[PDB]
Every structure is written in C-alpha cells, then in structure tokens.
From a paper:
Here, we present structural studies on one of these proteins, H. pylori biotin protein ligase (HpBPL), which catalyzes the transfer of biotin to biotin-accepting proteins. HpBPL catalyzes the activation of various biotin-dependent metabolic pathways, including fatty-acid synthesis, gluconeogenesis and amino-acid catabolism, and may facilitate the survival of H. pylori in the high-pH gastric mucosa. ENDScript analysis reveals that HpBPL has a prototypical bacterial biotin protein ligase topology.
The pyrophosphate group from biotinyl-5-ATP in our HpBPL structure forms hydrogen bonds with the three catalytic site residues (Arg46, Lys99 and His182).
Residue numbers in the entry: 3 to 211
Write the structure that this text describes.
Amino acid sequence: QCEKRVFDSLPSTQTYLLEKLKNNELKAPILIVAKNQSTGIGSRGNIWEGTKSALTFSLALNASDLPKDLPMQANALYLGFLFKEVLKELGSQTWLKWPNDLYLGDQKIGGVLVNVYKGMRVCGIGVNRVSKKWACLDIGASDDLIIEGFLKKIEENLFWGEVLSKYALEFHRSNSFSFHNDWGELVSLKDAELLEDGRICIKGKIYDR
Ligand SMILES: Nc1ncnc2c1ncn2[C@@H]1O[C@H](CO[P@@](=O)(OC(=O)CCCC[C@@H]2SC[C@@H]3N[C@@H](O)N[C@@H]32)OP(=O)(O)OP(=O)(O)O)[C@@H](O)[C@H]1O
C-alpha cells in the first residue's frame, strides 16, 4: 500500500497535503494523518473543530486510482459512501447524509471533503471518536483498522454506477434533513430527488456541493 505520515499535531492534514502537492514535494498516492488538528477545514471554509480524540486524515489519489465513470461532482459522495461502508462492516450505524456528511442517528459525527488539483484528488475525512461537545463514532475500531479498510474499498475499484445504486437505496434518509447551499442558506431535502451524477433536484432546481 501507500506511504502514511502521522503527525501528532497539524493545522490541517488537507492544507498540509495540498501545499505539498502544489510544491511537488509529494506525489499521490499518499496518506496524511494528524492525531490532533488545530485549524480543521469543513466545507465552504467553515471550521472543522478538533475534539479530544478524533480521526482526521487526508488521502491523495490519482485519477487513475478512481473509476473512469466517476464525475468530478460525485467525488465526496463516492469516497464518503465507501468510508461509511467501512464503518458499517466494523459494526457502526453511521449513515451518509447528502451531500457529504457522516451521521449517527440524526447527529453529525464526521464529514468528507474532496479537493481536486491537477487531476489528483485529495480526500479529507474527519470523524469524532471522543468529545463532550459533538456526537462520536459508535465503534471502537482503531484508526489504522478504519483507514486500512478504506484503502481496500477504494482498491476494489467499483464503478461509480455501482456505488450510487447502493447509496440510492439510502438517500431517502436524507429527506428529513437539510443542507447549506453555496451561499450558506439552509435548504430542506424534503422534496429532493437524487440524480445519476450525485447531484439532487428540488422542484426543478439542481444542487451540488
Ligand atoms: N468536530 C465536529 N463535530 C461535529 N460538528 C462539527 C465539528 N466541528 C464543527 N462542527 C459543526 O459542523 C458544521 C461544519 O461542517 P461542514 O461544513 O463540512 C464537513 O463536514 C467536512 C469535514 C472534513 C474534515 C476533515 S478532517 C481531516 C481533513 N483536514 C481538515 O482540515 N479537512 C479534512 O458541513 P455542514 O455543517 O455545513 O452541513 P451540511 O452539509 O448539511 O450543509 C458546522 O455546523 C460546525 O459547527
């Protein structure tokens, strides 16, 4: 498998990895783990807060490492769904709320973030393990076990077509919830319908993230 670097603390594994690729100091595939993040990044430049114990890493892939039929807009959905299936095989009840959120019950415990740079895809995943502020993962699997499973699910190289069909079975759970559009405004998923490229339509309007 691919090299892993583990830091006790970084501002952000995503920022670290992106800047190393931009400077041509690393090459995909490579995996970057921070035991603690001090300036984690969510979606839309929101903060992803560090908990007492959290799983936070970023994984750089080459396009060739992903299905040929995977649209760029579906990156977070595809990698997020595989991560969730890794969690489910380890006994977790975690589910994927559209577009890229890891939920337990009806509370967010983690999220997926994909940045694209020169055809390389930088997948950043955070999941709370221990915290008094936020909900946490419902299993005890080591971080190494979760990440190894993740690398293997990616390695199975399933068509995007297959993965979305699995997710389409559970999209409906998202209908009770909402997401933030590009301008930060809450939008209900009640009437949202899934599209074959991972986007949704709500009464004739298409959304992505
Ligand atoms: N610890 C916490 N637990 C629960 N909730 C928390 C929280 N900290 C803040 N919150 C609240 O969660 C909202 C903001 O999260 P978010 O913008 O993005 C994401 O999930 C992407 C996460 C990817 C991080 C990984 S870590 C390893 C890489 N390096 C790093 O730098 N990036 C990646 O999603 P969102 O809330 O806007 O919801 P919708 O998708 O439904 O619109 C907001 O509420 C906030 O208070």
